[PDB]
Amino acid sequence: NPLFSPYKMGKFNLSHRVVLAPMTRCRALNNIPQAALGEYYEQRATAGGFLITEGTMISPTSAGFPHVPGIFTKEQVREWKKIVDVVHAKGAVIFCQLWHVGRASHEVYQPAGAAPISSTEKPISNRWRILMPDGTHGIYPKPRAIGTYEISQVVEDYRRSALNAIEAGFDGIEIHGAHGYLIDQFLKDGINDRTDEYGGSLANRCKFITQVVQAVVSAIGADRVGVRVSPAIDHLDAMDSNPLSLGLAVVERLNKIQLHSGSKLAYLHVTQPERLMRTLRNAYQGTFICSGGYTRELGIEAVAQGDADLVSYGRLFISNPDLVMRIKLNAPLNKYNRKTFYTQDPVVGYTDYPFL
Ligand SMILES: Cc1cc2nc3c(=O)[nH]c(=O)nc-3n(C[C@H](O)[C@H](O)[C@H](O)COP(=O)(O)O)c2cc1C
């Protein structure tokens, strides 16, 4: 089974290629990482296995889901440290995904009920609704389009959060540049209507992600930085007229960051909607994680055919804490319950999915 050949993700030698994809679960009450998170990640950790945490806030203005963890305060650092220690005691490698939702927010999630920030003042259209803290769904508001000074401040928030993640003991961080969130609101020409140096051409639209990645690379080292993008996913009104071109343009800038820094990133992580994946892999000089709809058989095939070095699983990892072992044994998998993806119980639908 090619998923069980070892792989060197730079200075981290992984024992197998099954990766826990980042998944928002909303158990981090009041943005504090809770003991429940430690139990959840511990159940899924394996010796030499790689885990990516749920999206984690970089600033008070970065959230658009309830009870998502932050890593911008020293209190949050202390609590993450307890979780990282538990996962490291099982021999796993763990990266913290840094997440800013941009315009995908609501007054209820913003300090003082302020408008969320974006590249644009265009709101997400009414076809999408936001999950509210009470479990209902609300309307995405009009965001505030930020100037270039504020862009530099957001980059600094990523930089400080990356340093905080290292202080908590994380092996690295992943930049969430996917799924229509803040970075994707700069990348995608269906969203980015700017006429300044951050809008228009591919080079201008890639400026923000480039500056974010460079900032965190300078702060913690390229080999501790992964990058996640989704050029072909149009979630939250995040379409590009030419997804393949956009994906290749991002890869270009990542390859250049690696040359100028003299080191490789930890990986590029691309997720697809339920030949583009292979094309970006072929263009990128480094480790590639594929994601989106992978099964045991499709993951085996992806590694065997050279389409990816690592394969990340999301929904099946929700309901199969021992997903790695089930893939190894070709054991039957447990169903997942969508109703408890984003609820707040520390156990129900979170840690009570059974082992083999
Ligand atoms: C409940 C849920 C939460 C998710 N949260 C995140 C997230 O925080 N960051 C991210 O990049 N992707 C997130 N995703 C997308 C997944 O990481 C993954 O790419 C997606 O589920 C497709 O892979 P799969 O077929 O293995 O589930 C989430 C998906 C689900 C279903």
What three-state secondary structure class fits 338?
Answer: helix
266-303 b/e (C-beta count within 10 Å ≥ 16 → b):
bbbbbbbeeeebeebbebbebbbbbbbebebeebbebb
Task: From 18, 23, 58, 323, give the residue whose CB has the most ligand 1 atoms within 8 Å, as the site to mutate.
Answer: 23
Class of the 2-340 domain?
alpha beta
Rounded to the nearest angstrom, the distance between the alpha carbon of 204 and the centre of ligand 1 is 28
Please report how the helices 243-261 and 207-220 are oriented relative to each other, as an axis angle in degrees rounded to 10: 30
Count of other CB atoms within 10 angstroms of residue 127: 8
**Strands 172-177 and 144-145, how do they pair?**
unpaired
The structural domains of the chain, with segments of one domain joined by +, span: 2-340
Q: Whose CA is nearest to atom 4 of ligand 1?
A: 23
Q: Give dist(CA 9, CA 11) in Å, integer.
A: 6
Longest dimension (CA), the chain: 55
What three-state secondary structure class fits 200?
Answer: coil
Q: What is the dihedral of CA 113, 206, 255, 3, to 10 degrees?
A: 50
Resolution, given in Å to one decimal, reads 1.5
Q: Give dist(CA 113, CA 345) in Å, integer.
A: 26
* CB distance 190 to 238 below 8 Å: yes
Ligand 1 in contact with 313 (CB < 6 A)?
A: yes
Instruction: Compute φ and ψ for 185, nearest 5 degrees.
Output: -70, -20
Burial class (CB in 10 A: 0-12, 13-18, 19+), 171: buried
Method of elucidation: X-ray
- Alpha helical stretches, state H, 45-110: 74-88
Alpha carbons within 13 A on the beta-carbon side of 33: 28
